[PDB]
Every structure is written in structure tokens, then in C-alpha cells.
Amino acid sequence: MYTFVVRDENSSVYAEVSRLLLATGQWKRLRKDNPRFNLMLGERNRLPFGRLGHEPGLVQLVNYYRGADKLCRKASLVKLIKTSPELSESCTWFPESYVIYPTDEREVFLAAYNRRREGREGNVWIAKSSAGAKGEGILISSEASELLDFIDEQGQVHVIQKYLEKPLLLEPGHRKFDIRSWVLVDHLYNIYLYREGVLRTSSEPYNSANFQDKTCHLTNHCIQKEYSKNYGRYEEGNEMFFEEFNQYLMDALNTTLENSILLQIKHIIRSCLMCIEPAISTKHLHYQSFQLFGFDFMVDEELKVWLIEVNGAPACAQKLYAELCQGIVDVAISSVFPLATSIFIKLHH
Amino acid sequence: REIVHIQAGQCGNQIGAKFWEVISDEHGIDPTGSYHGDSDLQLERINVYYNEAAGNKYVPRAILVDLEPGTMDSVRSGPFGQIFRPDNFVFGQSGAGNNWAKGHYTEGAELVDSVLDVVRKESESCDCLQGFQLTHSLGGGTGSGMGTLLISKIREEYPDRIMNTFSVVPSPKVSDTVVEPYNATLSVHQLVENTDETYCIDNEALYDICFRTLKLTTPTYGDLNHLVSATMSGVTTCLRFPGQLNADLRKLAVNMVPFPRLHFFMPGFAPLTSQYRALTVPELTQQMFDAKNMMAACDPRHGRYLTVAAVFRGRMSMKEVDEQMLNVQNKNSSYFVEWIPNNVKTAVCDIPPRGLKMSATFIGNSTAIQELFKRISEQFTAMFRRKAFLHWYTGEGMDEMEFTEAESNMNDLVSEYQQYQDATA
Amino acid sequence: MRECISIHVGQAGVQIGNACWELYCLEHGIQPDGQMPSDKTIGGGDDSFNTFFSETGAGKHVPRAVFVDLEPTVIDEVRTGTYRQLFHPEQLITGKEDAANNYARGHYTIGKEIIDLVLDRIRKLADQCTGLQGFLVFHSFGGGTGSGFTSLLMERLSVDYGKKSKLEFSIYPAPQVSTAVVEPYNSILTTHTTLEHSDCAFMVDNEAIYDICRRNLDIERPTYTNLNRLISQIVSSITASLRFDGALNVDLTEFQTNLVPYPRIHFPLATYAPVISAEKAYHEQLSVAEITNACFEPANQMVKCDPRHGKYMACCLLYRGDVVPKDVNAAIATIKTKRSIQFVDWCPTGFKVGINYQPPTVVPGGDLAKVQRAVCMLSNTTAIAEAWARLDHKFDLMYAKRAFVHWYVGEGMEEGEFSEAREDMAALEKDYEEVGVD
Amino acid sequence: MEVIELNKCTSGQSFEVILKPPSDPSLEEIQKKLEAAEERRKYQEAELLKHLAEKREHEREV
């Protein structure tokens, strides 16, 4: 029967997958460095892609796409969008962004900053990085100078995306949020969108004049659970599902989640992944790859969807692990290693 | 690349005789030494074990040794008695009385020089000597005591040549005398230093195989030797017949022995015989990795494989063996050390043994061989702590520290197997 | 004109040499007896094919080759095979007992005894050269002779032929056909000692040839004969520039200039297409665009790896058959817009191209189909380092336990050479990453 | 996409297409180390033959 190895012990998603695989009675686990495996649940950094697919008589699959980092790191994502003809500088769903080193865009960033300054247009900018966990290393200011010195205060790269000053605010609460979507790409490069997303919602009322607050503006589950007093009032753990957010949109705005938001979501997902398809595809390769991505979106008050970032090692909501993890095994693993409806929306292309 | 064969003692000469009977049949040589075979593949490597004599006669490159003439006279009268070179029979009269000391120090020392003389005459007639193989038991006196003495003498004159042995390990279920653990423990210490490969043929397994699997109520030494000769034929098929494998004794040792002292192999054979139903490739691979087909009374699941070699004989799908060989890996992947990559070898010989369409020979370097040495060590200490039956040996000049030293070296050998059995990457 | 001497070391080198020289004779119209009816220059000449063949007064065309193995069974097959007449006895050198897959035995113990003889026989051919260019050395990484003695020979050629070029054709070990487990040791040991003595080395992974034979030739279980004839075609396309008229890669020096900007990083990746089975009575003949695109499918590379995740330092396209420049440029234009081909910033993004109008030649009764056009791409990409990493990892697994090390120490080598060579590989693997990744 | 240095003859043609411009040890110490490895083999063999010699002595002490 089939064999697999676990090399990322701190993975919530694949800890359930490996657990469900053993309960099948047709999968056997091995130590981290046993090379005679059918499936690798590999590490997150420096995964040895070069050692895969060289074992006679063993079809080898892995849960990561070599090169997918170019889409999952903020600095590289900006580069990909600005230099890829498929995406182009004239991209309508990605906020105006610039990569700033402490190749560089320090001066071109200020060129557009003053073109808005003179025109009285909103000049709120945000600085971000993929190296700061637990919401550390974020800044929202309206004066550009006072952020470049802070960027140089550290010795790594930061990006400067736009701050969406007019988000969609939920009522009751007058509060902010972002949307997390989970997308599975199998060995055939079929793009599967998990039907169940989640709203990661802020519990503090949005305040435009005061960006001093560390929590009025950042909605990630953690910064609201150990930095705010209102965690859990309107919904459990600042997490609202699609069925409710859909009902709210029908009642409050007379529209649906599918029409107003999800079509834009599906367009961005397939646009981003089809851009890098020829650089990471494992169709005619000696090993094959799949990977589950976590796309983070955000909706403005005109119901326009914006992409903020893509996470390549995402966690899932407590309330969908069982269903999602089962879907991975069904579509990503058993599809390659067969045994003795659907939760995914296939994004065709 | 010639091999020089030596058979010493009762057990050594009988299993040696069967061996020459079996491979002689496979190479098409009759009891008189004349070739009446159908294929030229039989002769392309006949020189490995046979000299070409006057009259297009082929003579085994074998030396026959014993301290009493009994078994050697039987051999000269047996089926293939007349094929051996008469000047290669070297015997004494007294005997060794199942005493390692007599074979190694007193009675054997008297005869050893005469044996080495025949070795030199055989080696001088070798275009390029490849090494030596010895057949003998470890429980007696001649094959055990004198056999190890010969090995020590051969490594002296031919220090850069390979020395391998087919050694029959004693077992109480098949026992001639009680001092067998003493003789075995003294012999193994010699084999740890002066042999490159020792195939551990355990009489306990040969009996259990004849009785349990083959359903033979009263097995004789002849029944056990049928298994031994079949295995030795299978082990030597890689040199005796011409595949695209360029196999030399040293090259094979380099590939199977990761550490000098750990060169004790578990032989295996399949199918087990004493029917006409064609056996399937899945069945051959599944049986040859089963404990019931092992010639050493050890459980491979109680240890781990350092290296493995499987030899298949007959016309079969070389693709199918690979698929099944790769399949069995998973079913016992935990029992293969991961710090020796690709440590399982497979060879195929188009020529089947006599009366078998397909066969398989198994050679495993497993740390589970340790179980065998513990068994012998226990039987040794059970007597030695009371100094039982030691007078037989002290009467021949041996001191008790030689027994203590041999005991400690085998316990060391056991401990060395244990460290690598627990070792991980 | 300038001669080239081929040196075939060990079983792999000798058997691959057999296939190569067999193919050369067919391509040049030379018969097994050494006669060349089309050669009107009797007893001599300075034609391009004379770079690989000398001429006798009797009209015989003799390969400028040396076969050397530490045991005679393989070269004995040469002395009795279809091409007995092609070579003369002094060109075939054999020992008595081999190196038993032990680098130390081939380099030290036995190598000392035959090195002087081999160099002597090589000098006897060199004295027949008016303007010797260098040597082409064929050998395996895994064999004790192919690894240990080859390294020793390479060192001595650099002292006796300091200013002369040396190219390698190396067989990289693959478990699917390899009957040895210590080949990682020998591979690392020989690469370390030979690296500074080789100007350009084309390494062929038996794994790649094995799958190519199974996938594209539908040979259920390939043999060495199947593998070698395919390898010979790649070797022939690579050396055709030296044997036929042309402007590209006509001197061994040009290989280093065109393909190797840094000396240590001199392992170009070879990709070949099309491989078509002879059993298929007729195959839709592939166009210039199709075979050129095939040059970027890793399933056609001599080494399994992903160039998309490395960078190119040079690239040459060697076509044979019905090819014209315009069709090549058309294919390249589309390919650039569909493939991930990023060069290092300090090298130009261009292809050096050469075309021979004579189409590929295949052995009669072989497994390869006759095609109208074919191409071999030579690219120096950092992605090939994946092979070093694979090899280095297996080395580390066994050496941590000192498994089999006693076999080498017993032949006079020191443990320090293991770590000394491994560290050299560690630097090489790091050099590839510096050039290849940001 | 520029084509350059186009040479051609009866056997074929050659050219270069550009899509973008850019942005030893001596003999003695070889033959010495061979000898150093040989002497290490001879020392190992002498130790073996000495070890065996010790055993021959004990054999006839018995």
C-alpha cells in the first residue's frame, strides 16, 4: 500500500490530513528522511525538490509547488504583477504597490505620492513585510517621510501598498474585515476553490482620523484576540461564514455574495495562478506537485474586490478542517493514488 | 579468475561432495569428467571451478582434507568420487574426536603443511587466482579446529586474496556431542578476523525446514545437505554462468560488507523442495524474504538489513521481478537501514537448477544474525561457568583464558551488531 | 587540421566507445576493415574527418583511440568483435584484476602499475599528430577503474600535456542499472581530484537514458546495448563539429569558450530530440519548432532536472539534417514567449547555432528510427547542480557511519580524502547557488 | 532579435542569435602521494603478518 512522510510538524492542515490518511488502512508513515515514499508533506523552508522523482518504481507526490514562493511573498508578488504582461501595470484589482529596499522603487514611490498630494486625493499608505508574524512591523501613515526612516530602521525588504480608506463596513458595528479563500491546485493544475470562505472581522469601529490604534485597522484573527476587548461579540472568534454574510448582503444591500464579490474572487484566483502556470507546472516532470493556497481579499464600499496577499502555508478555520482536509485527500492525493457532490468550485481555463 | 575450493572434516566433505555433484550436472560434466552438455554457456566459465586436463577432461579445483580417512573414502566411492584429482586427497589417521584443540593445535598442525602444499600447486596453475572457499562445520574438530588453522595459514601466504566460507553452525536439535558450543565459539573468533564472507548455515533451520515445511518426520544429514548444496549452487551462479554481470569475489564483498567484522550472511532459497506446479514471480519473492526460507535460525524482523542480494534463476519477466522486488521493499521498508541507499541487489541467470523452472537464492547481511551468536554464547557460558568438559581441551595444551578471550570477542561481535541495529540517519 | 585522441577507460568507457566508433564509421562511410572508398587521399590527408582517424599506406583508417580497462573481458570483446580490424593491438590495454568498484584500488594500488604503460601507448599516438588539440575521455563515475584510474590519468595528462584541452564524457550512477552501492563515494572522490584538470565535461545520468528508452522506444527492460547506442548519438552530435566542415565548435578550445564562463562550473546539460522507435513503421516527422521546443522538456535531458529554477550561462543548438536558419529563429521566437529561460545578468541572452545538412545516422537493425532532422542542445544551467546535491546527500548518509570506508583505507587511502573531497563538492554546490539564485 | 556571424559552407551553416545583451601539481608530488599510499599499504600488511607471527608463536606454545 501507499507510503508517506511528514516533514512539517507545525502544520495544522496536514496534521489532520496525515491523521486521516492513517485511518484509511492503506497508507503507512515513515521517519522524516526515509526516501522510499509515495507522498511528502514537506517542510516550509528549503524543501529538497531536487531529490524528488529519482526513486525507481515509486510515483512521488509533494504538497508544494516549487517556485510558488514568487506569488506568496509580498515583495516578489509586487514584482510579478508589475512585470508580467498577463497582469501588467494596468491591473485593476491590486492596490498601487512599490517594493522599497532599506531594482528599488524609493523615488518612483514618492513620484505618485505627490501627484496625489497636490490633487487633495487620499494619501494614506501602508508598509508591510512577510517576515513579521503576530502583526509586528506594520505602519499606516499619511506622511511618506516618517515611514521610509522606519523602513530603513530595519535591514530587510518592505513593500508599500495602498491603504483602502473606504472599505465596506459591517453593521451593526461599523467595523472592518477581510476575506480568506482557500484554493487547491492538484497535479493536473486544476484550480479548485473551496466553497466555504470566512470573514476575518474587526471588532472595533473603523476610525479614519486615528490610525494610532493597533487594532482598529488590522483584522487578522490574532491581533483581535489578544489586543482587543470586543473579541467574540457579534460572532464567534471574529469569524463569519458565507451563509451569514450572504444573508446580510441580501437584506442590507439587496445583492448576493456570488454576484457582488465572488465572481471577482474567482477571476483574481485564476488570473494569478494561470500567470505562473508555465513556471511551476509539473505535468511532464519526474515528480508531481499540489498545493493549497490561502488568498486574502478585501472589499471596498463600492463592492470592488482587492487582493492584499497570498499565503502559501495557510491555516484553516477550526470549523472546516474536517471537510476541507477530506477534500484534499479526495482530489489531491487519492486522485494520484486511487483506493478500493463536491466541496470545490472548479475554476476552468 | 579461478577459485580454489577446500572441504575439511565430515560435514565439510559431504556438503562439498553434493556441491560438486550439483554444479557438475549444471555444467554438463559427467562423473568421469567428460562434457556432454547442450549449450556453450555451460563452458564459458567452467574454468572458474575446474581445471582442463589432458583428454578434454575437467577436474574440480578442490582439495579434500580430514584427520580420519572414513568420510574421504566414502567420497572416493560416491557417485562423483572419481572426478577429484587423486593427489588432492590429504588425510590423517588418528582423527580429532570433535575437539577444536586437536584440529587447531596438535593433530591438525601435524597435517596442515601437507595441505598447503596442494594449495600451492593448484594456485601456481591459476592464471589469476580470485580467492578461496571453504566448506566445514564449526561444531566438530577437524573442520572447526583445523579448518580455521588452514584459513590462518592461507591468509599468511596469500594475504591479498579473498577468503570465504560456507560454515555449518551447530544446534542442540541436531547435535553429535556436547562440546559443540565450545568449538563453535573458538572458530567464530577466527572467522571474524580471517574471512571476507561467511554464509551461516544453521542446522537448526535446516531441521525445522525439513520437518515443519517439507513435512519430513525423520530428517537425515542427507536431507539437510540437499538444501545446502542447492543454496551454494545458487550463491555461486553469479560467477559460474555468463550474465552481463561482471562479478568478482572482491567486487561482491565490497558491495555486501560495510564493516570488516560484520560479514556473516543469512542464506535463503525458494522454492523449498525434497511438485510440478509453476511458481509465480510474486510467490518467489515473497518466500525468499520469509523467515521460513532462511538457512539461519534468526528472525529478520527482529533486526535490520545492512545489504541484501537476490538471485533469480530461470526465464521470467525481468520487469516483473523488479516490480515485485520493489514491492517487497515497502512491506519491510522499516527493516532496511536508510543510511545505505539502494542496498538491495538483484541478479538474474537464464539457466535454472536441476528440475526447477524457476528458483531464487537469498543472501542477506542482517543484524538479526546476532540472534545466532547469542544462542551459541548462552550454550557456551552454561558449561564454561562450571568449567565442564574443559579437561578435553586443557589436556591438549590450551589455557582457560583462551576460552575467556573467545567468549569476550563473540559478545563484542554481538554488541557491534546491536549498535548498528539501533542506528538511524 | 588538428587531431583529437579519444581515451576510453573502464567497462562503461570501452562499451560506449564501441558504439561511438561504430557510429562514426557509418557516418563517414568507413567499413569494418578500415577501408574508406570515398577517401581519395591515399595514405594521408588533412581532411576534417582525419581529426579522429589516421591513414596507413595500405589505405586503412585507424581510430586515434585508446581503450584501457583493468580486466580484459570487455576489451577482449573488442579484439574479437565486428571491428577487430579497425584497431591495432597496441591501442588496447588490459590488466589482470579490476578495481572491484573501489576508487582507491583503481587510483593507487593498481593505477601505479599501469599508468606508465598507458601514457607510453598514448604518446605513441601523439607522435603521429601534427597539431594535437586535446583528449576526449570516456568513463563512468561508479566503476573503480572508470573513477579511480581516470582521475590519475587526468592528473598525468595535465603535466605531460599542460597546454592541451581535455573533455570528459561521464556516466552518472543510477540505481536502476547500477550493480553497486559505493558508487556515490567513487563519484565524489573522482570529481574532486579531476575537477581542476577537466575543461568541459558532459555527464550522462543512466536514469535519464533508461526512462528515455522505456518511454520513447517502448523497450520494456533496456540493456547496455540500448543505452549505449542512444548515448553514441548524443556523443556523435556533440563531436560532429570536430569531424565535419563547419564554423562552430571546430576546436576543443571553442567548447570552453562557448559553454564555460567559469572553470569550475563546466558541466553543460545536454538535451536531445527526437527519439523515435524503429518498430513504428512510420512516424509523423517532427518540425524544427517541435524538436527545438522539445529541447526544453526535462524528459529529453541527459540529466533529470528543472532548468526553470536555475539560470543559463550559455546555450548552443546543434542541428543535423534538414534545417535552415529562418526556421530556427521562428521556433526560438515563440519558445521565448512560452518558456522560463532567464540568463544570468552578466552573460548575453543568445543562442549559438550550428547546422549540419547530413541527417542523423542510425545503426542498421538498431532501435532508433531514421529522422529527417534532429537537434542536440548544450546548455550550461545551474539546475544541473541538483545532480550534485542528490549525489552529495547519499555520500553524507553512508559516511556519517563510515560504511565501507575500510575498503578504501585498506588500499592506502586516508579518511581525510573523503572529507577533503566532500568539502570541495560543498563549495561547488555553493558556487552553483551563488550564480543561480538571488 | 539579431542574427550575427553567419558562416556557411556545403555541409551546413552556423550563426548566433541574441535576444538581449547582458545587464597544477607537479609530477613528483603526484608520484610521491602514490608512494605514500603504497607505504601505508605495506605498513598495514606488516602489522597483519606480525599479528599472525604472534599467533604462530602461541600455536606452538600450546
Ligand SMILES: Nc1nc2c(ncn2[C@@H]2O[C@H](COP(=O)(O)OP(=O)(O)OP(=O)(O)O)[C@@H](O)[C@H]2O)c(=O)[nH]1
Ligand atoms: N551508461 C553505461 N554505464 C555503464 C556501462 N558499463 C558500466 N557502466 C557503469 O559503470 C559502473 C560500474 O563500474 P564499471 O564501469 O563496470 O567498472 P570497470 O571499468 O568495469 O572496472 P571496475 O571498477 O572493476 O568495475 C556502474 O555504475 C554502471 O552503471 C555502460 O555500458 N553504459
Ligand SMILES: Nc1ncnc2c1ncn2[C@@H]1O[C@H](COP(=O)(O)OP(=O)(O)CP(=O)(O)O)[C@@H](O)[C@H]1O
Ligand atoms: N490595501 C490594504 N488596505 C488596508 N488594510 C490592509 C490592506 N492590505 C492589508 N491590510 C490589513 O492587513 C491585514 C492582513 O495582513 P496580512 O494578511 O498581509 O498579514 P500577514 O502577511 O502577516 C499574514 P499572511 O502572510 O498569511 O498574508 C488585514 O486585516 C488588513 O486590515
Ligand SMILES: Nc1nc2c(ncn2[C@@H]2O[C@H](COP(=O)(O)OP(=O)(O)O)[C@@H](O)[C@H]2O)c(=O)[nH]1
Ligand atoms: N548438515 C550436516 N551437518 C553435519 C553433518 N555431519 C556433521 N554435521 C555437524 O557437525 C557437527 C559434528 O562435527 P563433525 O562433522 O564430526 O566435525 P569433523 O570431526 O571435523 O568431521 C554436528 O553438530 C553436526 O551439526 C552432515 O552430514 N550434514
Ligand SMILES: COc1cccc(-c2cc(NCc3ccc4[nH]ccc4c3)nc(N)n2)c1
Ligand atoms: C562464497 O564464495 C562465493 C562464490 C560465488 C559467489 C559469491 C557471492 C554471491 C553473491 N550474490 C550475487 C550478487 C550479489 C550482489 C551483487 N552486486 C552486484 C552484482 C551482485 C551479485 N554475493 C556475494 N557477496 N558473494 C560467493
Ligand SMILES: [Ca+2]
Ligand atoms: Ca602424532
Ligand SMILES: [Ca+2]
Ligand atoms: Ca613444508
Ligand SMILES: [Ca+2]
Ligand atoms: Ca582522407
Ligand SMILES: [Ca+2]
Ligand atoms: Ca589543465
Ligand SMILES: [Mg+2]
Ligand atoms: Mg506571510
Ligand SMILES: [Mg+2]
Ligand atoms: Mg563426526
Ligand SMILES: [Mg+2]
Ligand atoms: Mg571492470
